[PDB]
Design a protein around this nucleic acid. Structure first.
Lengths: 138, 64, 60, 99, 187, 185
RNA sequence: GUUUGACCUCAAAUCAGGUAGGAGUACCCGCUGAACUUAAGCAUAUCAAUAAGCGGAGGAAAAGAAACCAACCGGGAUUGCCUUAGUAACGGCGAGUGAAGCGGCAAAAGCUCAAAUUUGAAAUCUGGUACCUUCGGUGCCCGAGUUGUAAUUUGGAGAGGG
RNA sequence: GUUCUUUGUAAAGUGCCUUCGAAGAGUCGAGUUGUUUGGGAAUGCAGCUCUAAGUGGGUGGUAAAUUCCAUCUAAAGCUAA
């Protein structure tokens, strides 16, 4: 019925390689700044919504308060120890609840927290909590 | 306070007092919201104004 | 010599002559000081003492 | 209810073991407190009635609760709000005349 | 305290008490200047609800604004009276930062607002960890940039599906509809 | 001759005089009109003579008392204090808890909405109350420039009887006298 | 007492100390706002919430921790990329116009008030002054403040008592 | 990596029993005029008129009425990448 008779705008990504380099530099800088902590927090396993995607699980935002309590810690301490906490998510699925509780137990058994006053034992930096605790399809 | 009340009343002349009533009635009017018919009248009035010739052309034609 | 004499006359005073004050930039002179920028509330200070960011690692 | 494990029909959907989440107190956002009731009753006694409330009372007396509710809906914009206002005025009438 | 009583009573705006107070006060306001400094908040509960504190560095100005019908040009409407009031007060006291504002009164010619202002230079503000955020240079003339509560409401800054039909929403949709995004390896 | 009738006064003087005229000329709702009925000269003098014995601690006196406590620190160090209570929210809380034995309410509060509910609250709570002339006079009692309210909750043994007589006097002179008129416009 | 004051409100000072204006404006946030053009030449419409005009910021701005999306075995602040998709839909014999949630990824971060009786102690704060170990500390003093400044609580909770 | 007073029955977290549990108004919402988005019911914003409630309120735009259900918790505020 009616045509587009005007002139478009153009966005060109000449800086694609430069921005990849910049993101890599920023990640290395942040790793040095927070060493020996990882670059990412521990995230929970979560079912995708809608009937198209509910057949698979993915990473969520943060562990439920109930899951943190079941794992045996408080939200404030978990946030300081490197665990994402999400207050607005609720549990109505015991499978997901159990998986997230076991996830937290394994993370606690696999990390070493240094004393806030004592001398630090030598410990190398592992960058990806995500890689060390991958989400697995049930 | 007959003295004070008459002093202020005569200053204004220079149940409720006159200064108060006039001040209140200046701002106690009714804001009935505009109606569709009046709005259409506004639009057509603007159209009539915008469809006028310029005075040069009007006066030249009138003189001819 | 004269400016240094005035400086020693004013040493330690709260208010100095503006020409003896640091120039920097208008915006830099309008910015909050370190003290004002560092002020925290009592509640936030208590939370910071109780739950600081921890130093941890992923090995065991 | 309990999901029937099939993709259509009544109560369709996958079946997983249920959990009951703790009831969040934000869901208790409109609840009334004893002090809140006390304050509202005292303020009602102090302030009295708005003029449209007065004529709602008059309508309830004379022309019928149906017409009172209709006038209240005209002045409020919502049928549920008209119902709430008319019930409030009915309670006020009962307390101000009978008990 | 007295908060619950004040909030309930000031909600009951058609009662005899509040009508009488409104009448007397609006006449007095018409006597005073169009923009003037208020000695104290007329509604302390509302003011401290919007962030006012009774301490040095907090200022209340009362401002009178003409209504949509009652303009003096010496119909299209998109400008908020509360926004106009806040901007005029901010221009009158540009050493200050406008925090919030609230309705106090109205007549058939004017609406009456009270604007809350904070002094960013006062040490009682600069050393207060709860308010010195407003001392940062990024908050100069919030009301002029539309960052007050009325500004955000007029701009339509809200979450969800109902808030894409704004100026900003339409700008984003226009650049979506007719921006070519050309990558190095063309997609 | 005296030109005060024809003196062009400043705007602020003129406005305050017109406000005074308006307040008396207008028909005032009773919940506000009740504040026009106050304690009489004799009973107000007696009430203030009672309260001035319980005028609270000043800053200099607090330094002296904290000096004694510091000596005894390194309940017992200082005695139980008796003083009038004066904050508005504090006194509303005391009334709602019925801890207050007598409440004094200034008649001149602007905005009046801050105290317009207090007599009704005190009636619903059974607390004796009295409207007195002067937030400034009330503030003198508590070391402030003005005070919206004042209250006695606890009194000394040598003053219980005086407090009870003052309450009875206010009841006879102020409750029975103004009960009919405070409900009318 | 025809006096002497306590307050409130309103002023004044070349009063003590501060602050605003103008520039730049690529990017950012508001206000205000066309027409050419394109659609039979068009008043709807489009161009376009664009140009011009006015105001306001920063190194980024704005937005931002749900009065959200959904309708699932549910997700979970904001932003951006890829996407959804050139799809559904509309109109046309094939000219054209045209979404959103989900999904993958970049980056990740959470919090603050109001609403409470400290009432066995306004526990709070500006300023002047004197000293000091001076982006500030302490003593004294004039003040602000009870028409409410601190501590305590913020919905995920939380408070009182045991 | 060294040194200085250790702060301190000051501050904070976790367990159970019980009593509570304050949560923003000329706003929300409604009608109308203009404007904006839409094929459209309808939607956002501004002016004007009317103007709530507390087991409440908003949202879930196919026509309206009704009953359920689901989901958040407005009318106040800050915040890096």
């Amino acid at each position: 019925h009616f045509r587009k008779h005007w002139q478009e705008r153009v966005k060109v990504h000449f800086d694609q390689a430069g921005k990849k380099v910049s993101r890599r530099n920023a990640r290395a800088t942040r790793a040095a700044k927070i060493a020996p902590r990882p670059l990412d927090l521990l995230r929970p396993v979560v079912r995708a919504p809608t009937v198209k995607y509910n057949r698979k699980v993915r990473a969520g935002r943060g562990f439920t308060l109930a899951e943190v309590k079941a794992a045996g810690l408080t939200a404030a301490y978990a946030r300081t120890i490197g665990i994402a906490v999400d207050h607005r998510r609720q549990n109505r699925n015991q499978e997901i609840f159990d998986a997230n509780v076991q996830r937290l137990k394994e993370y606690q058994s696999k990390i070493i927290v240094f004393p806030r006053n004592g001398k630090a034992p030598e410990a190398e930096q592992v960058l990806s909590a995500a890689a060390t605790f991958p989400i697995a399809q049930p | 306070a007959d003295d004070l009340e008459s002093e202020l009343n005569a200053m204004y002349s220079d149940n409720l007092p006159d200064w108060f009533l006039e001040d209140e009635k200046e701002h106690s009017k009714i804001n009935k919201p505009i109606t569709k018919e009046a709005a259409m009248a506004i639009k057509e009035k603007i159209k009539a104004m915008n469809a006028r010739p310029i005075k040069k052309v009007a006066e030249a034609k009138a003189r001819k | 010599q004269q400016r240094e004499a005035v400086r020693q006359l004013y040493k330690g005073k709260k208010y100095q002559p503006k020409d003896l004050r640091a120039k920097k930039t208008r915006a830099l002179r309008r910015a909050l000081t370190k003290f004002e920028a560092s002020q925290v509330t009592e509640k936030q200070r208590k939370k910071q003492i109780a739950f600081p960011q921890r130093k941890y690692a992923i090995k065991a | 209810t309990v999901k029937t494990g099939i993709a259509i029909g009544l109560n369709k959907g996958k079946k997983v073991t249920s959990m009951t989440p703790a009831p969040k107190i934000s869901y208790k956002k409109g609840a009334a407190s004893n002090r809140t009731k006390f304050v509202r009753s005292l303020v009602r006694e102090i302030a009295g009635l708005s003029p449209y409330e007065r004529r709602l009372i008059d309508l309830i007396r004379n022309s019928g609760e149906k017409r009172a509710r209709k006038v209240a809906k005209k002045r409020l914009g919502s049928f549920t709000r008209a119902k709430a206002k008319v019930e409030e005025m009915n309670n006020i009438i009962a307390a101000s005349r009978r008990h | 305290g007295a908060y619950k009583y004040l909030e309930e009573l000031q909600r009951k705006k058609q009662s005899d008490v509040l009508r009488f107070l409104q009448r007397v006060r609006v006449w007095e306001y018409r006597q005073k200047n169009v923009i003037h400094r208020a000695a104290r908040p007329t509604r302390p509960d509302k003011a401290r609800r919007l962030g006012y504190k009774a301490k040095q560095g907090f200022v209340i100005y009362r401002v009178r604004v003409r209504r949509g019908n009652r303009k003096r040009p010496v119909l299209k409407y998109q400008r908020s009276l509360r926004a106009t009031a806040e901007e005029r007060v901010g221009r009158r006291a540009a050493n200050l930062r406008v925090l919030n504002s609230y309705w106090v009164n109205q007549d058939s010619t004017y609406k009456y607002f009270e604007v809350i202002l904070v002094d960013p230079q006062h040490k009682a503000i600069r050393r207060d960890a709860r308010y010195n955020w407003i001392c940062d240079p990024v908050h100069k003339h919030r009301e002029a940039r539309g960052l007050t509560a009325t500004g955000k409401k007029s701009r339509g800054i809200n979450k969800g599906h109902k808030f894409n039909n704004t100026k900003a929403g339409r700008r984003k949709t226009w650049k979506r509809q007719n921006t070519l995004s050309l990558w190095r390896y063309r997609k | 001759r005296n030109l005060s009738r024809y003196v062009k006064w400043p705007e602020y003087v003129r406005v305050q005089r017109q406000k005074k005229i308006l307040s008396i000329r207008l028909k005032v709702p009773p919940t506000i009109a009740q504040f026009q009925y106050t304690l009489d000269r004799n009973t107000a003098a007696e009430t203030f003579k009672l309260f001035n014995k319980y005028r609270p601690e000043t800053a200099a006196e607090k330094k002296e008392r904290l000096t004694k406590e510091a000596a005894a620190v390194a309940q017992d160090a200082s005695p139980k204090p008796y003083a009038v209570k004066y904050g508005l929210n504090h006194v509303v809380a005391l009334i709602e808890n019925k801890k207050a034995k007598l409440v004094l309410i200034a008649n001149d509060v602007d905005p009046i909405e801050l105290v317009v509910f207090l007599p009704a609250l005190c009636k619903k709570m059974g607390v004796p109350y009295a409207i007195v002339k002067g937030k400034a006079r009330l503030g003198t009692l508590v070391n402030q420039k003005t005070s919206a309210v004042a209250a006695l909750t606890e009194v000394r043994a040598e003053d219980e009887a005086a407090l009870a007589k003052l309450v009875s006097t206010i009841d006879a002179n102020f409750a029975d006298k103004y009960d009919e008129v405070k409900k009318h416009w």
